[PDB]
Write a protein that binds this DNA or RNA. Sequence first.
RNA 1: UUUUUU
Lengths: 81, 81
Amino acid sequence: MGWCIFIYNLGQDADEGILWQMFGPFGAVTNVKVIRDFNTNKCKGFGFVTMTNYEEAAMAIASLNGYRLGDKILQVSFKTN
Amino acid sequence: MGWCIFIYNLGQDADEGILWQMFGPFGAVTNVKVIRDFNTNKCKGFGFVTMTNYEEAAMAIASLNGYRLGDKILQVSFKTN
RNA sequence: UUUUUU
């Protein structure tokens, strides 16, 4: 199943490409998702990345939590619920 | 096969019976479906109901959109796409 | 601020 990473504070413009670019360097990434409103196709402000190996995921989170992405401070953590 | 109604914000637990119960009072209902993950039958958070009369579907939509079902506010509309 | 149209 890998490990699901939740990213908060993406801009309404954000694309999957940016999630790939940020997490890719840390190890295997199997899925990225920007969450959009169905009717406007705008980003609702969050997204998800699945990484296969926990230690890689944890390194991504340690580096990216608090990143200034565009003009927002990201919150990055393992997905809850 | 009739007017397709989209219901968002069902619980993981949701069953067909809750859709029948809520939509039944409004008129003829021919089909209900809770959308579940294929390999784990957890509800994906949404479902569909098919009603045969336009005015009865409209009534159900206008009355149930915003309903507090369990601890979630439903979004109920005519299916889009 | 935790995956919204089979």
